[PDB]
PDB file of all heavy atoms in Angstrom:
ATOM      1  N   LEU A  27      25.348  -5.243   2.780  1.00 41.83           N
ATOM      2  CA  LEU A  27      24.095  -5.864   2.461  1.00 41.83           C
ATOM      3  C   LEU A  27      23.989  -7.284   2.982  1.00 41.83           C
ATOM      4  O   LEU A  27      22.927  -7.692   3.445  1.00 41.83           O
ATOM      5  CB  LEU A  27      23.888  -5.854   0.914  1.00 41.83           C
ATOM      6  CG  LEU A  27      23.369  -4.548   0.358  1.00 41.83           C
ATOM      7  CD1 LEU A  27      23.427  -4.593  -1.169  1.00 41.83           C
ATOM      8  CD2 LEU A  27      21.937  -4.267   0.823  1.00 41.83           C
ATOM      9  N   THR A  28      25.070  -8.053   2.912  1.00 37.80           N
ATOM     10  CA  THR A  28      25.008  -9.433   3.424  1.00 37.80           C
ATOM     11  C   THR A  28      24.984  -9.460   4.934  1.00 37.80           C
ATOM     12  O   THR A  28      24.331 -10.359   5.508  1.00 37.80           O
ATOM     13  CB  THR A  28      26.194 -10.272   2.904  1.00 37.80           C
ATOM     14  OG1 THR A  28      25.964 -11.645   3.210  1.00 37.80           O
ATOM     15  CG2 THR A  28      27.514  -9.843   3.491  1.00 37.80           C
ATOM     16  N   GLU A  29      25.594  -8.476   5.604  1.00 38.08           N
ATOM     17  CA  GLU A  29      25.406  -8.405   7.062  1.00 38.08           C
ATOM     18  C   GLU A  29      24.004  -7.948   7.406  1.00 38.08           C
ATOM     19  O   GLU A  29      23.532  -8.261   8.507  1.00 38.08           O
ATOM     20  CB  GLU A  29      26.445  -7.422   7.660  1.00 38.08           C
ATOM     21  CG  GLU A  29      27.846  -7.987   7.684  1.00 38.08           C
ATOM     22  CD  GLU A  29      28.003  -9.086   8.702  1.00 38.08           C
ATOM     23  OE1 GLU A  29      27.321  -9.060   9.744  1.00 38.08           O
ATOM     24  OE2 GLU A  29      28.842  -9.988   8.508  1.00 38.08           O
ATOM     25  N   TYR A  30      23.331  -7.234   6.525  1.00 39.29           N
ATOM     26  CA  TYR A  30      21.928  -6.886   6.760  1.00 39.29           C
ATOM     27  C   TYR A  30      21.066  -8.121   6.842  1.00 39.29           C
ATOM     28  O   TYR A  30      20.093  -8.159   7.633  1.00 39.29           O
ATOM     29  CB  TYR A  30      21.421  -5.961   5.664  1.00 39.29           C
ATOM     30  CG  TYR A  30      21.904  -4.521   5.757  1.00 39.29           C
ATOM     31  CD1 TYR A  30      21.859  -3.689   4.645  1.00 39.29           C
ATOM     32  CD2 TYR A  30      22.351  -4.005   6.962  1.00 39.29           C
ATOM     33  CE1 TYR A  30      22.271  -2.386   4.745  1.00 39.29           C
ATOM     34  CE2 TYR A  30      22.775  -2.682   7.039  1.00 39.29           C
ATOM     35  CZ  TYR A  30      22.748  -1.874   5.943  1.00 39.29           C
ATOM     36  OH  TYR A  30      23.138  -0.589   5.996  1.00 39.29           O
ATOM     37  N   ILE A  31      21.346  -9.134   6.028  1.00 41.99           N
ATOM     38  CA  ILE A  31      20.420 -10.248   5.840  1.00 41.99           C
ATOM     39  C   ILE A  31      20.877 -11.548   6.502  1.00 41.99           C
ATOM     40  O   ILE A  31      20.027 -12.464   6.621  1.00 41.99           O
ATOM     41  CB  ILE A  31      20.111 -10.479   4.336  1.00 41.99           C
ATOM     42  CG1 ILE A  31      21.409 -10.823   3.630  1.00 41.99           C
ATOM     43  CG2 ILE A  31      19.478  -9.271   3.757  1.00 41.99           C
ATOM     44  CD1 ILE A  31      21.175 -11.262   2.180  1.00 41.99           C
ATOM     45  N   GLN A  32      22.133 -11.681   6.870  1.00 38.02           N
ATOM     46  CA  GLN A  32      22.534 -12.894   7.585  1.00 38.02           C
ATOM     47  C   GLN A  32      21.901 -12.940   8.963  1.00 38.02           C
ATOM     48  O   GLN A  32      21.507 -11.923   9.519  1.00 38.02           O
ATOM     49  CB  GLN A  32      24.078 -13.018   7.659  1.00 38.02           C
ATOM     50  CG  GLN A  32      24.736 -13.396   6.362  1.00 38.02           C
ATOM     51  CD  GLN A  32      26.237 -13.528   6.477  1.00 38.02           C
ATOM     52  OE1 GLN A  32      26.793 -13.261   7.546  1.00 38.02           O
ATOM     53  NE2 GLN A  32      26.876 -13.957   5.422  1.00 38.02           N
ATOM     54  N   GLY A  33      21.823 -14.154   9.494  1.00 39.42           N
ATOM     55  CA  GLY A  33      21.004 -14.384  10.670  1.00 39.42           C
ATOM     56  C   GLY A  33      19.539 -14.292  10.302  1.00 39.42           C
ATOM     57  O   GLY A  33      18.817 -13.397  10.728  1.00 39.42           O
ATOM     58  N   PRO A  34      19.092 -15.250   9.486  1.00 39.10           N
ATOM     59  CA  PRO A  34      17.846 -15.172   8.735  1.00 39.10           C
ATOM     60  C   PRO A  34      16.873 -14.030   9.081  1.00 39.10           C
ATOM     61  O   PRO A  34      15.780 -14.242   9.610  1.00 39.10           O
ATOM     62  CB  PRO A  34      17.171 -16.543   9.027  1.00 39.10           C
ATOM     63  CG  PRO A  34      18.354 -17.451   9.042  1.00 39.10           C
ATOM     64  CD  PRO A  34      19.413 -16.693   9.777  1.00 39.10           C
ATOM     65  N   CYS A  35      17.288 -12.800   8.776  1.00 39.11           N
ATOM     66  CA  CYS A  35      16.433 -11.624   8.960  1.00 39.11           C
ATOM     67  C   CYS A  35      15.393 -11.629   7.856  1.00 39.11           C
ATOM     68  O   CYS A  35      15.667 -11.152   6.781  1.00 39.11           O
ATOM     69  CB  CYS A  35      17.263 -10.367   8.991  1.00 39.11           C
ATOM     70  SG  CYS A  35      16.383  -8.908   9.533  1.00 39.11           S
ATOM     71  N   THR A  36      14.224 -12.175   8.136  1.00 40.65           N
ATOM     72  CA  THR A  36      13.201 -12.356   7.133  1.00 40.65           C
ATOM     73  C   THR A  36      12.717 -11.009   6.546  1.00 40.65           C
ATOM     74  O   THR A  36      12.459 -10.860   5.355  1.00 40.65           O
ATOM     75  CB  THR A  36      12.047 -13.131   7.672  1.00 40.65           C
ATOM     76  OG1 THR A  36      11.677 -12.650   8.959  1.00 40.65           O
ATOM     77  CG2 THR A  36      12.428 -14.652   7.783  1.00 40.65           C
ATOM     78  N   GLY A  37      12.540 -10.006   7.432  1.00 39.26           N
ATOM     79  CA  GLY A  37      12.123  -8.725   6.973  1.00 39.26           C
ATOM     80  C   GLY A  37      13.060  -8.093   5.984  1.00 39.26           C
ATOM     81  O   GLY A  37      12.674  -7.597   4.932  1.00 39.26           O
ATOM     82  N   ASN A  38      14.385  -8.101   6.312  1.00 39.22           N
ATOM     83  CA  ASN A  38      15.394  -7.576   5.408  1.00 39.22           C
ATOM     84  C   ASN A  38      15.453  -8.401   4.128  1.00 39.22           C
ATOM     85  O   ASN A  38      15.628  -7.842   3.011  1.00 39.22           O
ATOM     86  CB  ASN A  38      16.739  -7.513   6.092  1.00 39.22           C
ATOM     87  CG  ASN A  38      16.819  -6.473   7.194  1.00 39.22           C
ATOM     88  OD1 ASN A  38      15.802  -5.843   7.520  1.00 39.22           O
ATOM     89  ND2 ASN A  38      18.004  -6.274   7.752  1.00 39.22           N
ATOM     90  N   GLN A  39      15.306  -9.691   4.227  1.00 38.32           N
ATOM     91  CA  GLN A  39      15.325 -10.541   3.029  1.00 38.32           C
ATOM     92  C   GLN A  39      14.186 -10.187   2.110  1.00 38.32           C
ATOM     93  O   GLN A  39      14.381 -10.066   0.882  1.00 38.32           O
ATOM     94  CB  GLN A  39      15.286 -12.015   3.423  1.00 38.32           C
ATOM     95  CG  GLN A  39      16.628 -12.597   3.813  1.00 38.32           C
ATOM     96  CD  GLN A  39      16.515 -14.037   4.264  1.00 38.32           C
ATOM     97  OE1 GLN A  39      15.456 -14.498   4.653  1.00 38.32           O
ATOM     98  NE2 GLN A  39      17.641 -14.764   4.264  1.00 38.32           N
ATOM     99  N   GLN A  40      12.975 -10.008   2.647  1.00 41.10           N
ATOM    100  CA  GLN A  40      11.845  -9.638   1.821  1.00 41.10           C
ATOM    101  C   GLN A  40      12.032  -8.239   1.234  1.00 41.10           C
ATOM    102  O   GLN A  40      11.648  -7.985   0.079  1.00 41.10           O
ATOM    103  CB  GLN A  40      10.566  -9.711   2.635  1.00 41.10           C
ATOM    104  CG  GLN A  40      10.146 -11.103   3.056  1.00 41.10           C
ATOM    105  CD  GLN A  40       9.985 -12.030   1.874  1.00 41.10           C
ATOM    106  OE1 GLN A  40       9.410 -11.667   0.846  1.00 41.10           O
ATOM    107  NE2 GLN A  40      10.507 -13.265   1.993  1.00 41.10           N
ATOM    108  N   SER A  41      12.602  -7.329   2.008  1.00 45.69           N
ATOM    109  CA  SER A  41      12.847  -5.962   1.491  1.00 45.69           C
ATOM    110  C   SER A  41      13.824  -6.024   0.329  1.00 45.69           C
ATOM    111  O   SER A  41      13.580  -5.345  -0.692  1.00 45.69           O
ATOM    112  CB  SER A  41      13.401  -5.114   2.637  1.00 45.69           C
ATOM    113  OG  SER A  41      13.598  -3.755   2.190  1.00 45.69           O
ATOM    114  N   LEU A  42      14.873  -6.787   0.436  1.00 43.45           N
ATOM    115  CA  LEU A  42      15.775  -6.941  -0.714  1.00 43.45           C
ATOM    116  C   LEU A  42      15.112  -7.598  -1.893  1.00 43.45           C
ATOM    117  O   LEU A  42      15.335  -7.197  -3.037  1.00 43.45           O
ATOM    118  CB  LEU A  42      17.049  -7.715  -0.338  1.00 43.45           C
ATOM    119  CG  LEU A  42      18.266  -6.984   0.210  1.00 43.45           C
ATOM    120  CD1 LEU A  42      18.090  -6.522   1.637  1.00 43.45           C
ATOM    121  CD2 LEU A  42      19.514  -7.845   0.079  1.00 43.45           C
ATOM    122  N   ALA A  43      14.275  -8.602  -1.606  1.00 46.89           N
ATOM    123  CA  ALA A  43      13.576  -9.288  -2.707  1.00 46.89           C
ATOM    124  C   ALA A  43      12.686  -8.331  -3.482  1.00 46.89           C
ATOM    125  O   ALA A  43      12.593  -8.430  -4.722  1.00 46.89           O
ATOM    126  CB  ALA A  43      12.747 -10.443  -2.121  1.00 46.89           C
ATOM    127  N   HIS A  44      11.985  -7.430  -2.807  1.00 46.80           N
ATOM    128  CA  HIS A  44      11.099  -6.470  -3.452  1.00 46.80           C
ATOM    129  C   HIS A  44      11.808  -5.197  -3.843  1.00 46.80           C
ATOM    130  O   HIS A  44      11.154  -4.320  -4.492  1.00 46.80           O
ATOM    131  CB  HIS A  44       9.903  -6.187  -2.567  1.00 46.80           C
ATOM    132  CG  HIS A  44       9.013  -7.351  -2.330  1.00 46.80           C
ATOM    133  ND1 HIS A  44       8.732  -7.852  -1.086  1.00 46.80           N
ATOM    134  CD2 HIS A  44       8.321  -8.145  -3.201  1.00 46.80           C
ATOM    135  CE1 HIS A  44       7.942  -8.889  -1.203  1.00 46.80           C
ATOM    136  NE2 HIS A  44       7.690  -9.075  -2.452  1.00 46.80           N
ATOM    137  N   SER A  45      13.075  -5.041  -3.538  1.00 47.81           N
ATOM    138  CA  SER A  45      13.839  -3.829  -3.897  1.00 47.81           C
ATOM    139  C   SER A  45      14.374  -4.010  -5.325  1.00 47.81           C
ATOM    140  O   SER A  45      14.003  -4.919  -6.074  1.00 47.81           O
ATOM    141  CB  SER A  45      14.973  -3.617  -2.855  1.00 47.81           C
ATOM    142  OG  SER A  45      16.034  -4.550  -3.055  1.00 47.81           O
ATOM    143  N   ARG A  46      15.278  -3.092  -5.714  1.00 45.38           N
ATOM    144  CA  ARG A  46      15.884  -3.093  -7.019  1.00 45.38           C
ATOM    145  C   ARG A  46      17.257  -3.797  -7.046  1.00 45.38           C
ATOM    146  O   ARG A  46      18.064  -3.492  -7.924  1.00 45.38           O
ATOM    147  CB  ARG A  46      16.052  -1.674  -7.541  1.00 45.38           C
ATOM    148  CG  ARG A  46      14.761  -0.912  -7.740  1.00 45.38           C
ATOM    149  CD  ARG A  46      15.067   0.496  -8.186  1.00 45.38           C
ATOM    150  NE  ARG A  46      15.778   0.516  -9.485  1.00 45.38           N
ATOM    151  CZ  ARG A  46      15.491   1.277 -10.498  1.00 45.38           C
ATOM    152  NH1 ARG A  46      14.552   2.185 -10.384  1.00 45.38           N
ATOM    153  NH2 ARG A  46      16.184   1.169 -11.625  1.00 45.38           N
ATOM    154  N   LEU A  47      17.496  -4.689  -6.110  1.00 44.60           N
ATOM    155  CA  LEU A  47      18.759  -5.381  -6.039  1.00 44.60           C
ATOM    156  C   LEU A  47      19.020  -6.240  -7.282  1.00 44.60           C
ATOM    157  O   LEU A  47      20.161  -6.388  -7.739  1.00 44.60           O
ATOM    158  CB  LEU A  47      18.851  -6.266  -4.775  1.00 44.60           C
ATOM    159  CG  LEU A  47      20.038  -7.203  -4.609  1.00 44.60           C
ATOM    160  CD1 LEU A  47      21.197  -6.415  -4.028  1.00 44.60           C
ATOM    161  CD2 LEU A  47      19.702  -8.363  -3.711  1.00 44.60           C
ATOM    162  N   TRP A  48      17.940  -6.784  -7.867  1.00 46.08           N
ATOM    163  CA  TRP A  48      18.059  -7.679  -8.999  1.00 46.08           C
ATOM    164  C   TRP A  48      18.659  -6.990 -10.224  1.00 46.08           C
ATOM    165  O   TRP A  48      19.434  -7.615 -10.943  1.00 46.08           O
ATOM    166  CB  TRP A  48      16.702  -8.316  -9.343  1.00 46.08           C
ATOM    167  CG  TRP A  48      16.033  -8.934  -8.128  1.00 46.08           C
ATOM    168  CD1 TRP A  48      14.863  -8.563  -7.566  1.00 46.08           C
ATOM    169  CD2 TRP A  48      16.555 -10.026  -7.357  1.00 46.08           C
ATOM    170  NE1 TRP A  48      14.584  -9.369  -6.483  1.00 46.08           N
ATOM    171  CE2 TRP A  48      15.592 -10.284  -6.341  1.00 46.08           C
ATOM    172  CE3 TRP A  48      17.698 -10.797  -7.406  1.00 46.08           C
ATOM    173  CZ2 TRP A  48      15.765 -11.264  -5.353  1.00 46.08           C
ATOM    174  CZ3 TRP A  48      17.865 -11.788  -6.473  1.00 46.08           C
ATOM    175  CH2 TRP A  48      16.901 -12.011  -5.458  1.00 46.08           C
ATOM    176  N   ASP A  49      18.268  -5.726 -10.494  1.00 46.73           N
ATOM    177  CA  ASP A  49      18.839  -5.002 -11.612  1.00 46.73           C
ATOM    178  C   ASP A  49      20.326  -4.791 -11.418  1.00 46.73           C
ATOM    179  O   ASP A  49      21.098  -4.933 -12.405  1.00 46.73           O
ATOM    180  CB  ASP A  49      18.123  -3.657 -11.771  1.00 46.73           C
ATOM    181  CG  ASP A  49      16.631  -3.812 -11.962  1.00 46.73           C
ATOM    182  OD1 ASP A  49      16.206  -4.827 -12.533  1.00 46.73           O
ATOM    183  OD2 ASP A  49      15.886  -2.898 -11.517  1.00 46.73           O
ATOM    184  N   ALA A  50      20.757  -4.449 -10.213  1.00 46.71           N
ATOM    185  CA  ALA A  50      22.200  -4.318  -9.934  1.00 46.71           C
ATOM    186  C   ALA A  50      22.930  -5.653 -10.153  1.00 46.71           C
ATOM    187  O   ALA A  50      24.027  -5.646 -10.727  1.00 46.71           O
ATOM    188  CB  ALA A  50      22.401  -3.807  -8.557  1.00 46.71           C
ATOM    189  N   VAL A  51      22.316  -6.748  -9.689  1.00 44.21           N
ATOM    190  CA  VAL A  51      22.954  -8.054  -9.893  1.00 44.21           C
ATOM    191  C   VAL A  51      23.052  -8.369 -11.387  1.00 44.21           C
ATOM    192  O   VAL A  51      24.065  -8.919 -11.844  1.00 44.21           O
ATOM    193  CB  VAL A  51      22.171  -9.145  -9.143  1.00 44.21           C
ATOM    194  CG1 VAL A  51      22.789 -10.516  -9.384  1.00 44.21           C
ATOM    195  CG2 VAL A  51      22.156  -8.839  -7.665  1.00 44.21           C
ATOM    196  N   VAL A  52      22.020  -8.057 -12.152  1.00 45.94           N
ATOM    197  CA  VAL A  52      22.051  -8.295 -13.582  1.00 45.94           C
ATOM    198  C   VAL A  52      23.128  -7.480 -14.285  1.00 45.94           C
ATOM    199  O   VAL A  52      23.885  -8.010 -15.122  1.00 45.94           O
ATOM    200  CB  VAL A  52      20.670  -7.971 -14.219  1.00 45.94           C
ATOM    201  CG1 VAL A  52      20.773  -7.994 -15.722  1.00 45.94           C
ATOM    202  CG2 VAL A  52      19.623  -8.965 -13.752  1.00 45.94           C
ATOM    203  N   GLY A  53      23.302  -6.211 -13.945  1.00 46.95           N
ATOM    204  CA  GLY A  53      24.332  -5.409 -14.490  1.00 46.95           C
ATOM    205  C   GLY A  53      25.722  -5.899 -14.110  1.00 46.95           C
ATOM    206  O   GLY A  53      26.645  -5.975 -14.951  1.00 46.95           O
ATOM    207  N   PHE A  54      25.883  -6.274 -12.863  1.00 46.34           N
ATOM    208  CA  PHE A  54      27.168  -6.806 -12.385  1.00 46.34           C
ATOM    209  C   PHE A  54      27.530  -8.112 -13.099  1.00 46.34           C
ATOM    210  O   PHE A  54      28.687  -8.359 -13.366  1.00 46.34           O
ATOM    211  CB  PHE A  54      27.120  -6.991 -10.897  1.00 46.34           C
ATOM    212  CG  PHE A  54      27.578  -5.820 -10.100  1.00 46.34           C
ATOM    213  CD1 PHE A  54      26.810  -5.269  -9.091  1.00 46.34           C
ATOM    214  CD2 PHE A  54      28.843  -5.256 -10.348  1.00 46.34           C
ATOM    215  CE1 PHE A  54      27.270  -4.190  -8.371  1.00 46.34           C
ATOM    216  CE2 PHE A  54      29.287  -4.142  -9.642  1.00 46.34           C
ATOM    217  CZ  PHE A  54      28.489  -3.606  -8.639  1.00 46.34           C
ATOM    218  N   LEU A  55      26.522  -8.945 -13.416  1.00 48.73           N
ATOM    219  CA  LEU A  55      26.761 -10.185 -14.131  1.00 48.73           C
ATOM    220  C   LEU A  55      27.290  -9.920 -15.515  1.00 48.73           C
ATOM    221  O   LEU A  55      28.274 -10.581 -15.945  1.00 48.73           O
ATOM    222  CB  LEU A  55      25.503 -11.038 -14.192  1.00 48.73           C
ATOM    223  CG  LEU A  55      25.226 -11.906 -12.934  1.00 48.73           C
ATOM    224  CD1 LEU A  55      23.848 -12.539 -13.044  1.00 48.73           C
ATOM    225  CD2 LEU A  55      26.291 -12.955 -12.820  1.00 48.73           C
TER     226      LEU A  55
END
């Protein structure tokens, strides 16, 4: 996932922002 978004890939960054990544981060926390 971090290789997807490094090198400011704005499209991938927006896709992660609007995806369900936040719920996974919350559970992992």
